[PDB]
């Protein structure tokens, strides 16, 4: 996360770290959506241009974390993966369209002060909140700048951007399964996701019921925190039918 700040303890209890077994290293962010299901970006698991193709046994998920590198004894919980599901129309060849994946845990995780699931949006909450100017929150242990790494989880609040502005900021083809967020050059403030934040959540707090909803998944950006560029996020609600199909069939 670029130009963010240290998270408060328990500020993002749905935050998940995808951790590579060997060598031991951060792979991506992710989020907890139930006691057995974790949501992330497809490109965290499958990205052939960079020779990335992880299988279940390659990874662990670490939940309840704050420190990036420490083993947080008595606080974090580490889970093995039962199965990975990648969206069947995930477009890694072109523009990361439908950049979404689910991971089922081998065993349910116990909720605690530090471990708790985020809500997924329904159509109405999506319609109400996914509006230009409305701000969401992005969290992760990714790099602090494009070209170092944080001691603890970082957080940044960013406004959703008008679709035509998103489109005009890039030569990449944008789709309805993406939205973009970030400040404009003229707005003074800044901030963005970066390498390592991939797969983490873009969340919003509904003013109607005071619950946090995951509206986006950290997907892509041209560099990190560049003037006139924006971060692009997978539109969770647009892909919720697939999410439900997977959970209903394999849950």
């Amino acid at each position: 996360i670029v130009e963010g700040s240290d998270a408060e303890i328990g500020m993002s209890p749905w935050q998940v770290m995808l951790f590579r077994k060997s060598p031991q290293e951060l792979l991506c962010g992710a989020s907890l959506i139930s006691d057995r299901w974790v949501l992330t970006a497809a490109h965290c698991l499958l990205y052939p241009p960079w020779d990335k193709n992880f299988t279940e046994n390659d990874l662990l998920v670490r939940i309840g974390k704050h420190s990036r590198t420490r083993y947080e004894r008595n606080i974090e919980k580490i889970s093995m993966l039962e199965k990975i599901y990648i969206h069947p129309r995930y477009n890694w060849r072109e523009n990361l369209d439908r950049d979404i994946a689910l991971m089922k845990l081998k065993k349910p995780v116990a909720f605690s002060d530090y471990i708790h699931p985020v809500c997924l949006p329904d159509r109405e909450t999506a319609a109400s909140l996914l509006q230009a100017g409305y701000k969401g929150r992005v969290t992760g242990w990714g790099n602090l700048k494009e070209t170092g790494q944080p001691s603890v989880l970082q957080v940044v609040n960013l406004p959703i951007v008008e679709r035509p502005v998103c489109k005009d900021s890039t030569r990449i083809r944008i789709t309805d399964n993406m939205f973009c967020a970030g400040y404009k050059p003229d707005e003074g403030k800044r901030g963005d996701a970066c390498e390592g934040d991939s797969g983490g959540p873009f969340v919003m707090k509904s003013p109607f019921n005071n619950r946090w909803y995951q509206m986006g998944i950290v997907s892509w950006g041209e560099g990190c925190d560049r003037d006139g560029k924006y971060g692009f996020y997978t539109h969770v609600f647009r892909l919720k039918k697939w999410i439900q199909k997977v959970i209903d069939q394999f849950g």
């Binding site: 303890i9 139930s34 708790h116 100017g133």
Partner: peptide
């Protein structure tokens, strides 16, 4: 489940985090 999105150390105790008000203020 029914408890999703309510943080034990915040919403569950009616405590606010330091920047959530920034979000609320943007929801005009």
């Amino acid at each position: 489940e029914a408890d999703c999105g309510l943080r034990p150390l915040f919403e569950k105790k009616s405590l606010e985090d330091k920047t959530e008000r920034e979000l609320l203020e943007s929801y005009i």
